[PDB]
Design a protein around this motif. Structure first.
Motif, PDB file in Angstrom:
ATOM      1  N   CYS A 174       0.833  -1.197   0.000  1.00 58.68           N
ATOM      2  CA  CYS A 174       0.000   0.000   0.000  1.00 58.68           C
ATOM      3  C   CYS A 174       0.871   1.252   0.000  1.00 58.68           C
ATOM      4  CB  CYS A 174      -0.925   0.001   1.221  1.00 58.68           C
ATOM      5  SG  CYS A 174      -0.086  -0.222   2.813  1.00 58.68           S
ATOM      6  N   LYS A 175       1.385   1.606   1.177  1.00 57.41           N
ATOM      7  CA  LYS A 175       2.245   2.774   1.345  1.00 57.41           C
ATOM      8  C   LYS A 175       2.381   3.064   2.837  1.00 57.41           C
ATOM      9  CE  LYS A 175       4.205   4.677  -2.185  1.00 57.41           C
ATOM     10  NZ  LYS A 175       4.752   3.830  -3.279  1.00 57.41           N
ATOM     11  N   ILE A 176       2.397   2.000   3.633  1.00 58.07           N
ATOM     12  CA  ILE A 176       2.504   2.107   5.081  1.00 58.07           C
ATOM     13  C   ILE A 176       3.758   2.848   5.542  1.00 58.07           C
ATOM     14  CG2 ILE A 176       3.689  -0.103   5.260  1.00 58.07           C
ATOM     15  CD1 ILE A 176       2.444  -0.493   7.994  1.00 58.07           C
ATOM     16  N   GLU A 177       3.670   3.445   6.726  1.00 57.58           N
ATOM     17  CA  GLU A 177       4.773   4.188   7.331  1.00 57.58           C
ATOM     18  C   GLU A 177       5.106   5.467   6.568  1.00 57.58           C
ATOM     19  OE1 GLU A 177       6.722   6.011   8.664  1.00 57.58           O
ATOM     20  OE2 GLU A 177       8.729   5.224   8.259  1.00 57.58           O
ATOM     21  N   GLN A 178       6.186   5.429   5.791  1.00 55.28           N
ATOM     22  CA  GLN A 178       6.632   6.584   5.023  1.00 55.28           C
ATOM     23  C   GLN A 178       5.635   7.038   3.961  1.00 55.28           C
ATOM     24  OE1 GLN A 178      10.949   6.528   3.931  1.00 55.28           O
ATOM     25  NE2 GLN A 178      10.948   4.484   4.860  1.00 55.28           N
ATOM     26  N   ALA A 179       4.564   7.694   4.403  1.00 58.05           N
ATOM     27  CA  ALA A 179       3.531   8.200   3.505  1.00 58.05           C
ATOM     28  C   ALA A 179       2.364   8.878   4.227  1.00 58.05           C
ATOM     29  CB  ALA A 179       3.005   7.068   2.628  1.00 58.05           C
ATOM     30  N   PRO A 180       2.600   9.435   5.429  1.00 62.57           N
ATOM     31  CA  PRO A 180       1.508  10.091   6.152  1.00 62.57           C
ATOM     32  C   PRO A 180       0.802  11.144   5.301  1.00 62.57           C
ATOM     33  CG  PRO A 180       3.323   9.744   7.612  1.00 62.57           C
ATOM     34  CD  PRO A 180       3.844   9.493   6.218  1.00 62.57           C
ATOM     35  N   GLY A 181       1.573  11.816   4.453  1.00 62.83           N
ATOM     36  CA  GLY A 181       1.019  12.841   3.587  1.00 62.83           C
ATOM     37  C   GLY A 181       2.005  13.232   2.507  1.00 62.83           C
ATOM     38  N   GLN A 182       2.126  14.532   2.251  1.00 55.08           N
ATOM     39  CA  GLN A 182       3.050  15.019   1.236  1.00 55.08           C
ATOM     40  C   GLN A 182       4.457  15.117   1.815  1.00 55.08           C
ATOM     41  OE1 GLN A 182       3.046  19.278  -0.103  1.00 55.08           O
ATOM     42  NE2 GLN A 182       2.625  18.407  -2.129  1.00 55.08           N
ATOM     43  N   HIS A 183       4.537  15.327   3.125  1.00 55.26           N
ATOM     44  CA  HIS A 183       5.818  15.439   3.809  1.00 55.26           C
ATOM     45  C   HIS A 183       6.043  14.254   4.746  1.00 55.26           C
ATOM     46  CE1 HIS A 183       4.618  19.399   2.487  1.00 55.26           C
ATOM     47  NE2 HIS A 183       5.843  19.857   2.664  1.00 55.26           N
ATOM     48  N   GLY A 184       5.813  13.049   4.233  1.00 54.04           N
ATOM     49  CA  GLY A 184       5.997  11.858   5.040  1.00 54.04           C
ATOM     50  C   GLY A 184       7.434  11.700   5.502  1.00 54.04           C
ATOM     51  N   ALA A 185       8.353  12.345   4.793  1.00 51.38           N
ATOM     52  CA  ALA A 185       9.769  12.278   5.128  1.00 51.38           C
ATOM     53  C   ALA A 185      10.051  13.025   6.429  1.00 51.38           C
ATOM     54  CB  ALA A 185      10.600  12.868   3.998  1.00 51.38           C
ATOM     55  N   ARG A 186       9.310  14.102   6.659  1.00 47.79           N
ATOM     56  CA  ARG A 186       9.474  14.909   7.865  1.00 47.79           C
ATOM     57  C   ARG A 186       9.359  14.059   9.128  1.00 47.79           C
ATOM     58  NH1 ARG A 186      11.296  16.818   5.326  1.00 47.79           N
ATOM     59  NH2 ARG A 186      12.902  16.219   6.852  1.00 47.79           N
ATOM     60  N   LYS A 187      10.414  14.073   9.935  1.00 47.19           N
ATOM     61  CA  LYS A 187      10.440  13.311  11.177  1.00 47.19           C
ATOM     62  C   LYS A 187       9.443  13.885  12.178  1.00 47.19           C
ATOM     63  CE  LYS A 187      14.420  11.926  12.769  1.00 47.19           C
ATOM     64  NZ  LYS A 187      14.602  12.578  11.443  1.00 47.19           N
ATOM     65  N   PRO A 188       8.406  13.106  12.529  1.00 43.85           N
ATOM     66  CA  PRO A 188       7.376  13.531  13.479  1.00 43.85           C
ATOM     67  C   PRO A 188       7.935  13.894  14.854  1.00 43.85           C
ATOM     68  CG  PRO A 188       6.569  11.739  12.164  1.00 43.85           C
ATOM     69  CD  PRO A 188       8.058  11.803  11.936  1.00 43.85           C
TER      70      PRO A 188
END
Lengths: 686, 82, 85, 205
Positions: free
Chosen positions: D31-45
């Motif tokens: 699917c796109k689990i983890e690294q894909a929360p949105g457009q800035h999935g790379a951004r460390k939460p």
RNA sequence: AAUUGAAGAGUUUGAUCAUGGCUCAGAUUGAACGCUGGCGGCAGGCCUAACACAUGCAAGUCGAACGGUAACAGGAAGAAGCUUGCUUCUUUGCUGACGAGUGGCGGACGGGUGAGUAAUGUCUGGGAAACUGCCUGAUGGAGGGGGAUAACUACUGGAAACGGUAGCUAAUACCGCAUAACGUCGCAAGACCAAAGAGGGGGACCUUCGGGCCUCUUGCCAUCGGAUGUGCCCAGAUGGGAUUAGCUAGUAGGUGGGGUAACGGCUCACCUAGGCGACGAUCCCUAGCUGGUCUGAGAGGAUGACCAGCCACACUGGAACUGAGACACGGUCCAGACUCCUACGGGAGGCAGCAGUGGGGAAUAUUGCACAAUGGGCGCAAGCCUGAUGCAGCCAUGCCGCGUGUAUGAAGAAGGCCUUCGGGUUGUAAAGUACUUUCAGCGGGGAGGAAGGGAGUAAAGUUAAUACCUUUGCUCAUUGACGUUACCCGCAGAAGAAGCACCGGCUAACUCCGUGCCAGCAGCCGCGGUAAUACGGAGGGUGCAAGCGUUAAUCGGAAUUACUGGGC
């Protein structure tokens, strides 16, 4: 106590100032210990007095005789109220046409007559002024024949003339009466027919027996031998012939002098029809493809009524008058409003009497009353509580030609004015409420001066609303007359802590005519990036916004083709914002540069004015600076076609009704926009 | 005078009569003397549904307190000794 | 005001004239009592008393002057005719 | 009062499978689990205490598919009762009818198990329940009506039912397709990646 | 087992600490407003003008209290509608009932409101000098007479409402007389006070064949009690201001008379000259009190809608009558304001009762159904009255649930946005393919609220009686506003149903473009004068969800009036 055959719903209809009110007030007196009551006892008053239905009793004898209830329908708050006459005719069975004996031409008296025939309603005539000078029964019977072609049959002959009017002779029973008093009618005596009138009495008597034998071979045979067809049948023959709209029995007297009125009441009973003597009202089922069915007046059959008048009451509140045609309407029951789609709660029934209110348990078919409750029911809607699929009807539409601006002096008057319209629109669904396009005012449209005159009184008082009651107001449109010679649009300001730049040149020329609204037209001639395409849209919006306001009076600009031929971009700017503005100034400059001029709406006018007031309507239009196209002949009248500035139409509505007593009428439709008249072109700028 | 009534402290569509000895004059769900049992019309068919204290009723009934219609019915419905 | 029980007005008014007259004749007798005591007439004191006692208790038993008030006068008056007589 | 929106989008936000797509595939992926929360999935939460304190209770919601308006009640309810407020809050949520249909196998997933609840496709100790807020109690026998029995989803739902961890506080069947809530899940069972002392603080301040 | 549970942050300065304000995170409310909005359950719904009000309705009932024929419902000697067996009123009150009327009872109960009142109040805890319809325990009387009146008849002033004379007649209407204690006055002796009869049924006999008489039931009258209700006394408690410090001459007390159900200056005459007041009188302002309610860890703070008790009020002011109880809410009289009716002489009426109207305001709804249930008034009962109440309609106001689909679904469409042009993102979302159908729609089935009454019977209690009546069983035929009820089943299609705020920090969520101290955002700090995550739009995301925001309000935060728990 509730006999369908003894009900007599009537309505006094006649030309204005002919004697409708006087005749009605007298009928209420004779029919009404309440007698000695009012005896020993102006717009507002004239309005209050008149009430929906006024009942009363009249019987030749208290016992061992036939008694009759006479419901006098009225209220028509306006001259020869066609709207109140029409609806009252459908809601009814009969009417009485009062003619002004002295009234020479009595032209608009024809208006009320057309309504009678419009709803195929039987009626009886009544020459109200026999006492007055010029009071001529014959003149009334001759004009009714020639101009109205109503086929009148002489029932009564006047005794004495004008001042010497002392009595009337019943020609059907061969007997007269004398009135010892000149007023208050407190003395009536059964007298034999005098000498100098016996001969004349025998002539018309055999003329009357002759008329009651036409449509029948049996009656024909007896007429030849002279044998008098049974009286009960002479009254029944005349009755059958008057109910089938073939003849019109004529009576005489003086409502004011109190003479012949009582004989008039007998005529109502002996000849006027009841809710049964009229064809079953028709209707359409809700199946799309018609399926018209007749509604027989049967009290035990499935109910079906028609609400014809919503009325705000300073007491009980909203009142919806109705006419039960079939079945019965009970109190405390639920009815189904099919025009809409919901059940309504019926709280109480109520009949409107001359002085008091009466709470009742029910209103059977053929009867009428007021209904408290019903919140979502309006005029025209049909109700059916038995489940019998309701039906509907409506075969007309009222005209206006008159609008009045109304800037309530305040916002407080703006709100209560909206209620004065929406609440009075349910009652009179002929006018219309709007908002001037180029202003933002309230415009009420009607049928006449007095109409809006009393409406205004109902606003300032009943709804408490003092306001600059408007009269004429103005508008206007604008355009150029010659091609522009250049006109640029330079917008360069360091407003923004950043430079702003826009440079456009345009060739705006007056535009050609067209059916469509395409009075505006844009064309981009930018040949080589002179002006970046990324901003062509900008300049289009800049132009657009400016057209909303003209230089003369700040009104929308139309009918013009704008072209772009040259421009450029600069060091920092070049934005949709930059060129949007760059387009604004270019338009403003051009419109003011290309010889501005006003454009007023020209209306197509058709004026029907007798055959005699025709030449008078023409001359009036010529003076209004209109341009005659040609006059059409309609019936014994004429229809004048011509163009005239809605501007200059100013008061033609009434000026036309003034030279015709209302004889004339007219319709007005929009035709086209033309270039104003120099004199008016100067008054606009401000 | 004093009379045993059923305080309609239940709910719409699903009432709950709360029998109580109070003065007839006072309102139904108003002031009362003392509570004594209750009554539930929608008690279905399971177990408890009408627990009425008779040892207290007979006290006032013979003290000078009258009896109502529905109340007297509940007294003759739940028998008396069994 | 049209409200059926309008009769309760004339009914209570009709009784007013009744109680007013009865309660009136009751005072006079009581008056002729303290009057005799006010002057000092020992004889008339009791004589006038044996005349009120019957009516006082009568009206008292009726309803226009129940208990107390009745035993009021007699008790006091009886304690007035034995002060200096 | 539901989500309807993309389910995986929520699981990928919490960084843990919410069993929202437990239909067939597992461990998510594809699917796109983890690294894909949105457009800035790379951004460390990088969030503060409040964040992680909310990312916990908000995660529990996405699971049982519960909303605040209803969740708030469970907290005040778990706080009213006697015992560890954190453990209690999990009890009520674990007592939900729709929930007592997932762990049993009657539903391939919570959202699906609840889909059958609404359409009154299941019953209890006799009567039929259509709501999901049915706080199931012990000694109860929840099951599916004779009508529309062993249909479609129910089959697949009971399929990967054994491959799952499978509870122990209930008695699920296959033939009669019935169930029995023996007891309420303790703090021991079902937990691992989940905190309570955190989901409480947020509603304590 | 049963009040076992307490958090913070932003902002002074260049920076720091401390002190000290403001503001936000949490709940709550009769809310309103803005946007949006599918259903069901329950609850609440004129906070401002106790502002003024149309109409209907909200308290009627008993003939087993009586005189009685007027209406319609039965019988009726005898007369007649007559088409010579098909059948109508002349009346009669014979009676099932009943207009008006007399009488009894309830109209003082329910219901509504926050006006006043800072103390004739309320809350709490006691007290003693009294009364107490109906409902009840006990013990006796229930004898015997008279004088009137409404209705109605005759006449008559009236527009109506509503009367004016002469007549006449009955009763559980009224008033005497006889009778008189365990009652009342009183130390005692003595003295003194009541009443109403009306119904059901009936065997030898009998009369002025209506009855007497026998008997039973229901009432009347008296006294002493129970119970309930009420009035009254007393202590504590019950808001703010000192920029109100003296207040009071019926005010404090004694005596005597008078006075009310009762005590008392409640009143008056006289005598006495004191009485209240820093522990806050008086005055001014404001406000109904309480059970409780909201919040808070608690202590407290705030509050007094709905439910329940109490007090007061009922257009304003004042007074009185009837009655056990009202100085009366649909009662009365007078004055004031106001509205309506009138033939102009003259009368009537008050929603701070239900709905509703005008008006005000930001804002709060139907002039519904039924007495089937509960309860109240009358009655033996059957029944009748009943806008209390039970329900329905309206509104998302709030609380608590539910649905608007569920799975499968690719190298990952198109398009839109971003892009170091590789790609990323929207995105299992859509399409496509299976499956399912609560709610809404349609067609059917169909709980509970129903227990008691009404006629037949079997006794058991009374009685001369198996007749009457009360009670308890039996048997049979029946009494639903809601409602197209709740609930359940069947049919079809995913078909009919998602918007809202925010995204600089506080505080979960950021890139681009557009704008450029301009336009605008803002709770606080603080953003915009060229790359702005804060402005506007878009992409995306987050927080919620038939609610979501905003504003207003109380409390907590606030140890920020700090008794618990602070400083100079």
């Amino acid at each position: 106590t509730t006999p369908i055959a003894r009900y007599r719903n009537i309505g006094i209809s006649a030309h204005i100032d002919a004697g409708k009110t006087t005749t009605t007030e007298r009928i209420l007196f004779y029919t009404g210990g309440e007698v000695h009551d009012g005896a020993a006892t102006e717009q507002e008053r004239g309005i209050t007095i008149t009430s929906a239905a006024t009942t009363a009793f009249w019987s030749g004898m208290a016992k061992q005789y036939e008694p009759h209830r006479i419901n006098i329908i009225d209220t028509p708050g306006h001259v020869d109220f066609t709207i109140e006459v029409e609806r009252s005719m459908r809601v009814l069975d009969g009417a009485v046409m009062v003619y002004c004996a002295v009234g020479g031409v009595q032209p608009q008296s024809e208006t009320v007559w057309r309504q009678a025939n419009k709803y195929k309603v039987p009626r009886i005539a009544f020459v109200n002024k026999m006492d007055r000078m010029g009071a001529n029964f014959l003149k009334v019977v001759n004009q009714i024949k020639t101009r109205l072609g109503a086929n009148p049959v002489p029932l009564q002959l006047a005794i004495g003339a004008e001042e010497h009017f002392t009595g009337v002779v019943d020609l059907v029973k061969m007997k007269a009466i004398n009135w010892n008093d000149a007023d208050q009618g407190v003395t009536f005596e059964y007298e034999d027919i005098p000498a100098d009138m016996v001969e004349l009495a025998n002539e018309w008597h055999q003329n009357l027996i002759e008329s009651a034998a036409e449509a029948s071979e049996e009656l024909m045979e007896k007429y030849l031998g002279g044998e008098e067809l049974t009286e009960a049948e002479i009254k029944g023959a005349l009755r059958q012939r008057v109910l089938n709209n073939e003849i019109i029995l004529v009576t005489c007297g003086s409502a004011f002098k109190n003479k012949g009125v009582q004989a008039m009441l007998d005529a109502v009973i002996d000849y006027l029809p009841s809710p049964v003597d009229v064809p079953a009202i028709n209707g359409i089922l809700d199946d799309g493809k018609d399926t018209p069915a007749e509604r027989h007046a049967s009290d035990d059959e499935p109910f079906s009524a028609l609400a014809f008048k919503i009325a705000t009451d300073p007491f009980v509140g909203n009142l919806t008058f109705f006419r039960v045609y079939s079945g019965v309407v009970n109190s405390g029951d639920t009815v189904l409003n099919s025009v809409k789609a919901a059940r309504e709660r019926f709280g109480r029934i109520v009949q409107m009497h001359a002085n008091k209110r009466e709470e009742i348990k029910e209103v059977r078919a053929g009867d009428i009353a007021a209904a408290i409750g019903l919140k979502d029911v309006t005029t025209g809607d049909t109700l059916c509580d038995p489940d019998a699929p309701i039906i509907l009807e409506r075969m007309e539409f009222p005209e206006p030609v008159i609008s009045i601006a109304v800037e309530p002096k305040t916002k407080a008057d703006q709100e209560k004015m909206g209620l004065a319209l929406g609440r009075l629109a349910k009652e009179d669904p002929s006018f219309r409420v709007w908002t001037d396009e180029e202003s933002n005012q309230t415009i009420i449209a009607g049928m006449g001066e007095l109409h809006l005159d009393i409406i205004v009184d109902r606003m300032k008082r009943e709804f408490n609303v003092e306001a600059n009651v408007g009269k004429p107001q103005v508008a206007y449109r604008e355009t150029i007359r010659q091609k522009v010679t250049d006109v640029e649009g330079k917008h360069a300001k360091q407003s923004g802590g950043r430079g702003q730049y826009g440079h456009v040149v345009i060739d705006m020329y007056p535009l050609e005519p067209g059916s469509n609204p395409k009075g505006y037209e844009f064309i981009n001639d930018i040949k080589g990036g002179v002006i970046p395409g990324e901003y062509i849209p900008a300049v289009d919006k800049g132009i657009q916004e400016q057209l909303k306001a003209g230089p003369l009076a700040g009104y929308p600009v139309v009918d013009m083709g704008i072209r772009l031929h040259f421009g450029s971009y600069h060091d920092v700017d070049s934005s949709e914002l930059a060129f949007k503005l760059a387009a604004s100034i270019a338009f403003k400059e051009g419109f003011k540069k290309a010889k501005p001029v006003l454009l007023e709406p020209i209306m197509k006018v058709e004026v029907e004015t007798p055959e005699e007031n025709t030449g008078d309507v023409i001359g009036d239009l010529s003076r209004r600076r209109g341009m005659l196209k040609g006059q059409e002949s309609e019936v014994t009248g004429v229809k004048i076609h011509a163009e005239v500035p809605l501007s200059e139409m100013f008061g033609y509505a009434t000026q036309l009704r003034s030279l015709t007593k209302g004889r004339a009428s007219y319709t007005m439709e929009f035709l086209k926009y033309d270039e104003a008249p120099s004199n008016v072109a100067q008054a606009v700028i401000e | 005078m004093v009379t045993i009534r059923l305080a309609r402290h239940g709910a719409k569509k699903r009432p709950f009569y709360q029998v109580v000895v109070a003065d007839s004059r006072n309102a139904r769900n108003g002031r009362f003397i003392e509570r004594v049992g209750f009554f539930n019309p929608i008690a279905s068919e399971k177990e408890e549904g009408t627990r009425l204290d008779l040892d207290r009723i007979a006290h006032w009934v013979g003290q000078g307190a009258t009896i109502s219609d529905r109340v007297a019915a509940l007294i003759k419905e739940v028998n008396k000794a069994a | 005001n049209i409200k059926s029980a309008k009769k309760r007005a004339i009914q209570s008014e009709k009784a007013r004239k009744h109680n007013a007259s009865r309660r009136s004749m009751m005072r006079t007798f009581i008056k002729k009592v303290y009057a005799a005591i006010e002057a000092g007439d020992k004889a008339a004191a009791q004589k006038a008393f044996n005349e009120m006692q019957p009516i006082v208790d009568r009206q008292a038993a009726k309803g226009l002057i129940h208990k107390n008030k009745a035993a009021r006068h007699k008790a006091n008056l009886t304690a007035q005719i034995n002060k200096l007589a | 009062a539901r989500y309807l929106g993309p389910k995986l989008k929520l699981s990928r936000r919490e960084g843990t499978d919410l069993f929202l797509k437990s239909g067939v595939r597992a461990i998510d992926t594809k699917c796109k689990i983890e690294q894909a929360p949105g457009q800035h999935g790379a951004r460390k939460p990088r969030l503060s205490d409040y964040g992680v304190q909310l990312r916990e209770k908000q995660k529990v919601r996405r699971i049982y598919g519960v909303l605040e308006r209803q969740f708030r009640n469970y907290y005040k309810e778990a706080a009213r009762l006697k015992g560890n407020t954190g453990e209690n809050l999990l009890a009520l949520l674990e007592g939900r009818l729709d929930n007592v249909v997932y762990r049993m196998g009657f539903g391939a997933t919570r959202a699906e198990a609840r889909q059958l609840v609404s359409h009154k496709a299941i019953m209890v100790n006799g009567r039929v329940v259509n709501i999901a807020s049915y706080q199931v109690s012990p000694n109860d026998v929840v099951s599916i009506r004779e009508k529309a029995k062993k249909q479609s989803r129910v089959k697949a739902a009971l399929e990967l039912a054994e491959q799952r961890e499978k509870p122990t506080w209930l008695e699920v069947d296959a033939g009669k397709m019935e169930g029995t809530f023996k007891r309420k899940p303790e703090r021991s069972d079902l937990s691992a990646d989940i905190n309570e002392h955190l989901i409480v603080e947020l509603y304590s301040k």
